Structure 1
Amino acid sequence: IVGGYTCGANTVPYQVSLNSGYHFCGGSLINSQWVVSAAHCYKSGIQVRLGEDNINVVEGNEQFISASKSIVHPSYNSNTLNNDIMLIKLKSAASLNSRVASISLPTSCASAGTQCLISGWGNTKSSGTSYPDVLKCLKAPILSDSSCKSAYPGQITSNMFCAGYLEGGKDSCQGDSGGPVVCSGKLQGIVSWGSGCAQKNKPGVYTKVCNYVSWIKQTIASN
């Protein structure tokens, strides 16, 4: 997260870190045994880390649970990043509490102008490289489809939306991938892509979660 703030320990209780020897992506806990992340975060040997603030220090509220399976969206295209969504099942159910909690799926899509919370352990520099140990947060509005398409001609599908600031300086970034965009207590987006980070006229692009609710529910129901 570039231009954000320190969230505070366990203030974003649905935020998970995906770890394969090291943090490589974010995710969102949507029930006791399932996480939603980006399809471009797919790999084998994933451990889901819940209850994290400082990802380098054991602080006492963590639960570390290996993934039993991952399910990348059947229509994910890694070139265009269309359908950039994946489900991860935990080997055992997380113990839910005030600091480890699921986030609700949308019942309807969020509109341009809606304020959302984006979070992660990604790079905090737009030019340099600096990875924080503690969770970073950014409040950012969803942008209009027209402004999103104008920013990224030929690249915005019906399964994507832009959020952030056309002026630059405030954005998600590398390492935030797969993490949540939560608006009015609903998971509306997944950190997917962007051209650099926090660059003028290049806002963050996010997977439009409301398009996948039926797939998520049906997949969970049979797996």
Structure 2
Amino acid sequence: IVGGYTCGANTVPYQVSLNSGYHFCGGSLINSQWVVSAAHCYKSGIQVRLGEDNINVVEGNEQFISASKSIVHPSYNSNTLNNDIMLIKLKSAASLNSRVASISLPTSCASAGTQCLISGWGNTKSSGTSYPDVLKCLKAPILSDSSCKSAYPGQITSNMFCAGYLEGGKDSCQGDSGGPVVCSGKLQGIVSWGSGCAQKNKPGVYTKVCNYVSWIKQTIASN
């Protein structure tokens, strides 16, 4: 997250870190057994880390649970990033508590102008590289479809939206991938892609979760 703020320990209780020897992507806990992330974050041998603040220090609220299964969306295209969504099942159920909690799925799509919270452990500089240990947060609005399309001609599908600031300065970045965009208490986006971070006229692009709710529910119901 570029241009954000330190969230505070365990104030984003659905935020998880995906770890394969090291943090590599965010995700969002959606029930005691299942995490939402980006398909471009797929790999084997994922450990899900819940209850994290400083991802380099054991601080006492973590739960580390290995993935039993990953499911990439059936229509994911890695070239265009269309349908950039996967589900990860945990080998055992998380203990839910005030610091480790699921985030509700949307019941309708959010509109442009809606305020959202974006979070992660990704890069905090727009030029240069600096990775934070503790979780960073950014309040940002969803942008209109038309300004998203004009920012990225030929690249925005009906399964993507833009959020952030056309002026630049405040955006998600590398390492935030797969993490949440939550608006009015619902998971409306997943950190997906952008051309650099925090550049003018290049806002972040997010997977449009409300398009996927019936696939998420029926996948969970049979797996």
TM-score higher than 0.5: yes
1:115 Cα deviation from its structure 2 partner? 0.2
Sequence identity (%): 100
CA deviation map 1:39-76 (0-9, x unaligned): 00000000000000000000000000000000000000
1:2 Cα deviation from its structure 2 partner? 0.0
CA deviation map 1:63-111 (0-9, x unaligned): 0000000000000000000000000000000000000000000000000
Runs of 4+ deviating beyond 3 Å: none
In the alignment, the residues of structure 2 paired with residue 109 and residue 84 of structure 1 have an alpha-carbon distance, to the nearest angstrom, of: 17
1:154 Cα deviation from its structure 2 partner? 0.1
In the alignment, the residues of structure 2 paired with residue 174 and residue 185 of structure 1 have an alpha-carbon distance, to the nearest angstrom, of: 25
Partner of residue 191, structure 1: 191
1:35 Cα deviation from its structure 2 partner? 0.0
1:151 Cα deviation from its structure 2 partner? 0.1
Partner of residue 78, structure 2: 78
In the alignment, the residues of structure 1 paired with residue 20 and residue 125 of structure 2 have an alpha-carbon distance, to the nearest angstrom, of: 24
1:161 Cα deviation from its structure 2 partner? 0.1
Structure 1 unmatched runs, 5+? none
CA deviation map 1:149-175 (0-9, x unaligned): 000000000000000000000000000
SS at structure 2 position matched to 1:220 = helix
Structure 2 unmatched runs, 5+? none
Tell me the TM-score normalised to structure 2 length. Answer: 1.00
In the alignment, the residues of structure 1 paired with residue 8 and residue 76 of structure 2 have an alpha-carbon distance, to the nearest angstrom, of: 34
SS at structure 2 position matched to 1:123 = coil
In the alignment, the residues of structure 2 paired with residue 82 and residue 187 of structure 1 have an alpha-carbon distance, to the nearest angstrom, of: 18
SS at structure 2 position matched to 1:150 = helix
Partner of residue 100, structure 2: 100
In the alignment, the residues of structure 1 paired with residue 208 and residue 214 of structure 2 have an alpha-carbon distance, to the nearest angstrom, of: 13
Partner of residue 116, structure 2: 116
CA deviation map 1:105-137 (0-9, x unaligned): 000000000000000000000001000000000
Q: How many residues align?
A: 223
SS at structure 1 position matched to 2:191 = strand
In the alignment, the residues of structure 1 paired with residue 69 and residue 107 of structure 2 have an alpha-carbon distance, to the nearest angstrom, of: 26
1:217 Cα deviation from its structure 2 partner? 0.1
In the alignment, the residues of structure 2 paired with residue 69 and residue 54 of structure 1 have an alpha-carbon distance, to the nearest angstrom, of: 26
1:15 Cα deviation from its structure 2 partner? 0.0
In the alignment, the residues of structure 2 paired with residue 15 and residue 70 of structure 1 have an alpha-carbon distance, to the nearest angstrom, of: 18
CA deviation map 1:14-47 (0-9, x unaligned): 0000000000000000000000000000000000
1:215 Cα deviation from its structure 2 partner? 0.1
